[PDB]
């Protein structure tokens, strides 16, 4: 590709990463994949207050602080160097480092953390130090911790005239801490991944769609003289922009070489916006589980008003109901006070709020959509339109997402001209048809992937279904949709993971696309593999997982030959709360699951401690992939039983092929050492004891890379392949 920079014109470093094509390129031409990890989920919440802590949760929050330092990696005791080296001996090269905006702002509007933004640029230097891409991630989940997640800072929630100790009683979000009440909380029984509902319940469902569309729906809630839109978009942008500006000032060189672009939003709520009836609950709302009450029946029980309510159970082919609860908030209101107001929102903080946003009263009858007096639904339809337009029928993702994106994208390349832009539509939604005046030709689709069933459910199951097809109404009935075998779920899955692939190059353009989460929970089967049940049988038997991760990560082998960045790596992952967010365990490493520099990991003459203690499942997520690739890969086949692994390549003639630009392929030592014993590795060192067979060319092995020379075709184009094997099957 050309030495200027398709966004600037600019000559490009010799580090440069070229994504204007299908497929990320060096200087030189080659193909490169980029697979590791996120890091870390332990950074969406501060220090010494987990998901299920309710003690100093409100406390702190409110007094404007917010210790994130030393998370995701601690730089006092030197673990950080540890937790990098085995991310780097496992064959990853990338890092999708995860900042909550709560993180930034939490003192206060435009009072930022620049103690934790040095954090963070430390941080990067070290992964830099270690040869890892970083491509930033503005996290969040479900707006914000004290809505059930992660994100956004606790001044936000009183932005939109919320009362945050409210939420509980009106069912309008569940948390953690105070579950099933903040009375008598037992977050031991928090149901598995019902935190994800939190986006169909009132304050996600305010939120959000003050967030994305705050001027289109709710034009009478004016904040500091604009609209609250503005108010909460331009404060995160701002806020983001300030640690992109923090890092092009303060350690610019960290840009292109290490940290290469940008996410989006991390996968942001849609509200309200696009219901096109607030009455009912859509089929095509993937996720419900608990107790779910409809649009205006989160706004009666916001108003303090009983509801019975639809419950929920996730059953093996997706939510069904069940129980038919009442929800009794006892006159109780989500929505603050006046009053409150005045000692705890816009004069706390320092903001002005508009004459006509009514307070202690639901926000929604004050623009019409119900009357209270009655609580009898006025306008059904009235987030399916535009109230300028009503002719107009609204599209998420066109109408407001993509909006937002272009306010985004113009701060993050204004501090970071070469960035490139990682474009991560909502979940379970096609990206929108994006204007090249802002990719100018450097970005990736980044979006996220899951095993829905396996994730919803913890299990394994011996069933699975065609979750995509049938949101693109591929089937007639939705039973063709199921696969049930490991075969025909492997090869459904990885059909599924095409069609993201399908997505960038059918809307967006020849852009790369990077599955920026995928994964599997480890505390499967009632945490049976950590020995809680059947007396302890089963422990540290993680057959489960490693077929479930062996299916996710197989997804992106194959023709796909996808970058992904695998959720997540938790340094401090325990058996008791798993990642300690919301009952989630993902994370690959744990300190219960227990029994130095780049250069040292780079020969390969490292502890096979490093590699194996501490992971679970370490043969499904350490695979062998190839790092640059002269041609563009055409086929990656990897199969842990026997260690084969096939590798197809496209050469054509035009393609840069010496004795200095060769094609590079990692093999783990995880599945292709002679031994990994520690006996043996204390007397000697870790060795490939491989078979290769290549269909062309010279090969080389040093440690654990692997390098391939071979000469171009005269003329048109071929496939060459490459056979990896060691010697005598699997490492027992
Ligand atoms: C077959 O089903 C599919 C298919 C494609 C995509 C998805 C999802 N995309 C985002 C999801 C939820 N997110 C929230 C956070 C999370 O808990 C990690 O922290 C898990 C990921 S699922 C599911």
Not at 53 to 75: C, S, V
Not at 351 to 359: F, H, N
Not at 509 to 517: H, K, S
Not at 581 to 594: A, H, P, Q, Y
């Amino acid at each position: 590709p050309p030495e200027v920079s398709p966004v600037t014109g600019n000559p490009v470093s010799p580090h440069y990463i070229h994504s204007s094509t299908l497929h990320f390129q060096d200087v030189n031409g080659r193909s490169l994949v980029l697979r590791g990890v996120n890091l870390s989920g332990s950074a969406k919440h501060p220090n010494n207050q987990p998901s299920h802590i309710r003690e100093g949760f409100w406390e702190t929050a409110e007094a404007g602080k917010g210790d994130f330092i030393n998370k995701p990696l601690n730089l006092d005791d030197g673990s950080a160097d540890l937790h990098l080296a085995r991310l780097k001996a496992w064959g990853y090269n990338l890092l999708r480092y995860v900042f909550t905006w709560e993180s930034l702002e939490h003192a206060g509007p435009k009072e930022y953390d620049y103690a934790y933004m040095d954090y963070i640029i430390a941080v990067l230097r070290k992964c830099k130090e270690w040869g890892f891409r970083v491509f930033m991630d503005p996290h969040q989940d479900v707006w914000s911790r004290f809505t059930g997640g992660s994100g956004a800072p606790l001044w936000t929630l009183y932005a939109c005239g919320i009362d945050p100790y409210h939420l509980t009683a009106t069912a309008a979000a569940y948390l953690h801490c105070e579950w099933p009440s903040a009375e008598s909380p037992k977050p031991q029984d928090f149901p598995a991944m019902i935190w994800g509902t939190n986006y169909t319940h009132l304050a996600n469902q305010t939120i959000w769609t003050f967030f994305f569309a705050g001027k289109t729906y709710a034009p009478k809630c004016i904040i500091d003289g604009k609209n609250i839109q503005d108010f909460l978009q331009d404060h995160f942008i701002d806020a983001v922009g300030e640690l992109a500006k923090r890092i092009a000032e303060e350690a610019g060189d960290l840009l292109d070489e290490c940290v290469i672009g940008w996410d989006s939003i991390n996968e942001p709520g849609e509200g309200l916006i696009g219901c096109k009836d607030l009455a009912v609950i859509p089929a095509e709302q993937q996720l419900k589980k608990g107790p779910s009450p409809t649009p205006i029946e989160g706004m009666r029980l916001g108003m303090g008003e009983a509801q019975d309510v639809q419950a929920w159970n996730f059953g093996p082919m997706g939510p069904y109901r069940g129980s038919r609860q009442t929800i009794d908030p006892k006159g109780v209101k989500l929505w603050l006070s006046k009053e409150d107001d005045v000692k705890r929102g816009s004069g706390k903080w320092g903001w002005t709020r508009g004459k006509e946003w009514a307070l202690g009263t639901c926000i929604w009858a004050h623009h019409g959509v119900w009357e209270i007096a009655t609580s009898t639904l006025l306008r059904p339809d009235y987030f399916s339109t535009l109230p300028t337009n009503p002719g107009h029928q609204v599209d998420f993702v066109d109408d407001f997402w993509a909006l937002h994106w272009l306010a985004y994208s113009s701060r993050i390349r204004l501090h970071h001209p070469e960035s490139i832009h990682f474009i991560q539509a909502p979940v379970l939604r096609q990206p929108p048809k994006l204007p090249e005046s802002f990719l100018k030709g450097r970005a990736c689709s980044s979006p996220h992937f899951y095993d829905g069933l396996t994730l919803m459910t913890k299990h394994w199951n011996w069933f699975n279904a065609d979750a995509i097809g049938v949101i693109r109404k591929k089937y007639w009935s939705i039973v063709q949709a199921v696969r049930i075998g490991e075969g025909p779920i492997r090869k459904m899955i990885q059909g599924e993971l095409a069609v993201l692939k399908q997505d960038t190059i059918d809307i967006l353009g020849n852009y790369p696309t990077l599955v920026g989460e995928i994964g599997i929970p480890y505390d499967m089967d009632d945490k049976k593999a950590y020995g809680y049940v059947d007396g302890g049988r089963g422990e540290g038997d993680y057959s489960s997982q490693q077929k479930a991760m062996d299916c996710s990560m197989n997804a992106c082998d194959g023709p796909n030959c996808l970058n992904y960045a695998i959720w997540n790596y938790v340094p401090d992952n325990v058996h008791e709360w798993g990642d300690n967010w919301n009952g989630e365990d993902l994370s690959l490493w744990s300190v219960d699951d227990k029994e130095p520099s780049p250069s040292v990991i780079d020969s390969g003459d490292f502890s096979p401690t490093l590699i194996l203690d501490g992971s679970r499942a370490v043969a499904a997520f350490c695979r062998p992939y190839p790092v640059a690739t002269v041609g563009i890969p055409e086929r990656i086949d990897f199969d842990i039983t026997s260690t084969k692994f096939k590798y197809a390549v496209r050469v054509r003639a035009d393609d840069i092929a010496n004795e200095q630009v060769y094609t590079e392929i990692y093999l783990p030592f995880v599945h292709y050492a002679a031994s990994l014993n520690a006996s043996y590795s204390s007397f000697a060192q870790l060795s490939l004891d491989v078979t290769i067979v290549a269909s062309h060319g010279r090969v080389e092995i040093q440690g654990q890379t692997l390098r391939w020379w071979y000469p171009v075709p005269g003329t048109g184009e071929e496939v060459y392949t490459i056979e990896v094997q060691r010697n005598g099957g699997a490492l027992r």
